[PDB]
Each structure stands twice: as structure tokens, then as C-alpha cells.
UniProtKB/Swiss-Prot annotation, chain B:
Biotechnology: Co-administration of salinamide and rifampicin or salinamide and myxopyronin suppresses the emergence of resistance to both antibiotics.
Identification of the protein by name: DNA-directed RNA polymerase subunit beta'
Section covered of the full-length record: 253 to 302 of 1407
Subunit organization: The RNAP catalytic core consists of 2 alpha, 1 beta, 1 beta' and 1 omega subunit. When a sigma factor is associated with the core the holoenzyme is formed, which can initiate transcription. The rRNA transcription and antitermination complex (rrnTAC) consists of RNAP, NusA, NusB, NusE (rpsJ), NusG, SubB, ribosomal protein S4, DNA and precursor rRNA; S4 is more flexible than other subunits.
Family: Belongs to the RNA polymerase beta' chain family.
Organism: Escherichia coli (strain K12)
Disulfide linkage: none
Post-translational events: Acetylated on several lysine residues in the presence of glucose.
Encoding gene per record: rpoC
Curated annotation (Swiss-Prot), chain D:
Biotechnology: Co-administration of salinamide and rifampicin or salinamide and myxopyronin suppresses the emergence of resistance to both antibiotics.
Protein family (similarity comment): Belongs to the RNA polymerase beta chain family.
Residues of the full protein shown: 449 to 498 of 1342
Assembly information from the UniProt record: The RNAP catalytic core consists of 2 alpha, 1 beta, 1 beta' and 1 omega subunit. When a sigma factor is associated with the core the holoenzyme is formed, which can initiate transcription. The rRNA transcription and antitermination complex (rrnTAC) consists of RNAP, NusA, NusB, NusE (rpsJ), NusG, SubB, ribosomal protein S4, DNA and precursor rRNA; S4 is more flexible than other subunits. In pull-down experiments interacts with CedA. (Microbial infection) Interacts (via flap domain) with Escherichia phage lambda antitermination protein Q; this interaction renders bacterial RNAP resistant to transcription pausing and allows it to read through termination signals.
Protein name: DNA-directed RNA polymerase subunit beta
Domain of life where this protein originates: Bacteria
Function: DNA-dependent RNA polymerase (RNAP) catalyzes the transcription of DNA into RNA using the four ribonucleoside triphosphates as substrates. Resistance to the antibiotics salinamide A, salinamide B, rifampicin, streptolydigin, CBR703, myxopyronin, and lipiarmycin can result from mutations in this protein.
Length: 50, 50, 156, 50
DNA sequence: AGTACGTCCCGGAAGAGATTCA
DNA sequence: TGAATCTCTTCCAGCACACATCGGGACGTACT
RNA sequence: GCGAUGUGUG
């Protein structure tokens, strides 16, 4: 039922919606949002558990 | 407030007025020089926010 | 210190320069900034680094130019005070050893090597508040006492 | 079992790390303009933020 | 030499979406 | 079509003490 | 001769 409620149906527009919740207003950009979501759970820099 | 020293623990009101005045003065100096519209917009925006 | 009077030629030149800066350079600067922001938005983008540095520099230069244009005042004396190298004349001083200068008293902003090399800032010119055709302008330069016999003064 | 105790050690470590991530920014900045060896690291480092 | 002086900056509750019996 | 039922987001959380620290940095210079 | 934060008192 969640997947039913989903508005989007691809990696592209998925990342789009994510970037849209993160930085409101600003227009999207494919590789921009790509790198963004890459820079939230998958890099030494801005995320870490000890 | 003259603190004991060569400084002054300025009240926030002072600094605020100060910012406003700098902003208004740059705006004044711009208009007479017909600087471009993007600049004057950024100017007015900073002013409103100030 | 910094004499708030500058040449009218310098004023016109700096005005045209700031016009060209805020009218031409800033637009392409912002365009390059946006193009770097296109999917870059990172701390590794050398393009974005150069763009931001140039943006800060352009901002500082524009602020300084606007301040000099408004607060200061222009001064370009005519040859009415000819001979008088107080202002408005490319005056020259010879030396006994070959230190021959030939410049005009210009402000501390439009300092270059396109018309002269003089400035109202150093005492070596501050002692020259109003010169003549035979003034023995001597001073204690930064590495010893220097001197120059005024050999020519005229405007153009 | 889910609360955790830090100590001066952890505090210093973490905050000192924040200091180094402060400095590294300008570090890499000035490295960008890097010229041939006429400099030394202390030229491209500033303790003052740390 | 190195700087004191320059600028530069959890509960509530009510509104605007926004959703659903028509 | 339109009156109900969610849902972001502004506003307030006791009184009176006592004492304590701390309050710009940064960037750039005409000199000191 | 101000404000922040903390500590303690009832």
C-alpha cells in the first residue's frame, strides 16, 4: 500500500523528490541530486558512526 | 555601555541600526549611478530583510 | 594620508571601468557560477572555487570603486597655475647622478605606469606641495638621503 | 544499555576534529593556488581557527 | 621587526493546505 | 461541487535570590 | 553602569 501511495516510479524522480524535500524552491538537477543523496549516507565526510 | 576596557559591549539595537544605515546608504549611492537591475534588486532585498 | 582629491581623468576612467565591471564582467561571472552550480555543488569543483573567489574579488573591487566615486572628489587643475607643480602639470626633476623623475601629482587610487608614477602619499612628494623650475627637492628616502633639482614643469 | 557516557577525552577529540575540518577548507583553498615549492606548509596552515 | 588601527559583519491552538463524502 | 478531517508552525513553560565566566574575528596597513 | 550561559539556594 505504501508503494501504491508513492507519487514517483523511478530512481530519477525519486532523487528529485528527495532533493526537493531537502533544498526547497531551488530547481532540480539530475547529477546534483545524485551527488546529494550520495552525500548523506555513503561518505566519510558528512556521515559517520563510530 | 562603556565597559572597563577599550571596547564597548554594544547593544544589539546599535548594530541593527548600523546595518540598516549601511544598507540604505549603498542603495542611495547605487540609484544615482544607475547600476544594473540585478544589483539593485539584491540591494533592496537585503534592505527589506535588514 | 590618502588625499580625497583625484584627477578628473582618473575619475572618468574609474567610472567607465566600474560601469564595464558591473555591466559586463559580473554577468559572465554569475553565469559561470551558475554553470558550476549545475550538478557540481561540491567542494571539489575547481571551477566553482575559482568562480567564488572571483565573485568575492569583484564584490570588493565594486565596493571600493563605488566608495571612491561617491565620497571622494575629483581635481584636475588647468594650466592657470602653469609652472606651479602644485597641481595639473607633468613636472620633472633631474639629479646630479641620474635620478630624473617626470610625473604628475596623482591620487592614491589611479596609481599605475600609463601616465606617471607619482602619488600624494609618500613624503618624497608631500614636500612638493607647490614646486617650481629650480626647486632642490631633497628628502630622507627609505635607504638614505636623496635629492633632485627640479628641472621641468608643464601641463598637457 | 542505550545511554552512553562520554568524557573529556571524547569531547576534546570531537571538537578538535571540528577544528581540523574548519582548517582543511582554507587549506585546500590555498593549495589550489599552489606554486612550485616556494612556500612551506605553515604558509598554508593557520593555527588560529583551531 | 609586528601591530593598534582600519573596515565587516512538548505540549496545546489556530491557520492554510489538502483530502473525501457529495 | 463543498463541508468535514488531517497537518505544518507560531507562542509559552513559576517566583525570588546568591555567586561565577564572558562578551569578534578577520583581514589588511601605515607605520611604530 | 548590560545581556547571555552555568551553578546553587529556597
Amino acid at each position: 500500500e505504501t508503494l501504491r501511495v508513492d507519487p514517483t516510479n523511478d530512481r530519477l524522480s525519486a532523487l528529485v523528490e528527495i532533493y526537493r524535500m531537502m533544498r526547497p524552491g531551488e530547481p532540480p538537477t539530475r547529477e546534483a541530486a545524485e551527488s546529494l543523496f550520495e552525500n548523506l549516507f555513503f561518505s566519510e565526510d558528512r556521515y559517520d558512526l563510530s | 555601555v562603556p565597559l572597563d576596557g577599550g571596547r564597548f559591549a554594544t547593544s544589539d539595537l546599535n548594530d541593527l541600526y548600523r546595518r540598516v544605515i549601511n544598507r540604505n546608504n549603498r542603495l542611495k549611492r547605487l540609484l544615482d549611478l544607475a547600476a544594473p537591475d540585478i544589483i539593485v534588486r539584491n540591494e533592496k532585498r537585503m534592505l527589506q530583510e535588514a | 594620508m590618502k588625499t580625497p582629491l583625484v584627477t578628473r581623468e582618473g575619475y572618468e576612467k574609474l567610472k567607465q571601468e566600474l560601469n564595464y565591471l558591473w555591466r559586463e564582467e559580473r554577468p559572465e561571472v554569475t553565469k559561470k557560477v551558475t554553470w558550476a552550480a549545475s550538478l557540481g555543488d561540491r567542494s571539489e569543483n575547481a571551477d566553482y572555487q575559482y568562480n567564488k573567489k572571483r565573485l568575492r574579488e569583484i564584490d570588493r573591487r565594486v565596493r571600493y570603486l563605488t566608495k571612491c566615486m561617491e565620497n571622494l572628489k575629483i581635481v584636475d587643475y588647468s594650466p592657470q597655475q602653469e609652472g606651479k607643480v602644485f597641481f595639473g602639470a607633468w613636472v620633472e626633476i633631474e639629479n646630479d647622478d641620474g635620478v630624473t623623475h617626470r610625473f604628475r601629482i596623482v591620487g592614491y587610487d589611479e596609481i599605475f605606469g600609463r601616465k606617471d608614477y607619482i602619488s600624494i602619499d609618500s613624503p618624497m612628494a608631500r614636500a612638493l606641495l607647490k614646486k617650481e623650475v629650480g626647486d632642490l627637492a631633497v628628502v630622507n628616502t627609505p635607504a638614505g638621503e636623496a635629492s633632485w633639482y627640479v628641472n621641468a614643469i608643464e601641463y598637457v | 544499555g542505550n545511554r552512553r557516557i562520554r568524557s573529556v577525552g571524547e569531547m576534546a577529540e570531537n571538537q578538535f576534529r571540528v577544528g581540523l575540518v574548519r582548517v582543511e577548507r582554507a587549506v585546500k583553498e590555498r593549495l589550489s593556488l599552489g606554486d612550485l615549492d616556494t612556500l612551506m606548509p605553515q604558509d598554508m596552515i593557520n593555527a588560529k581557527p583551531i
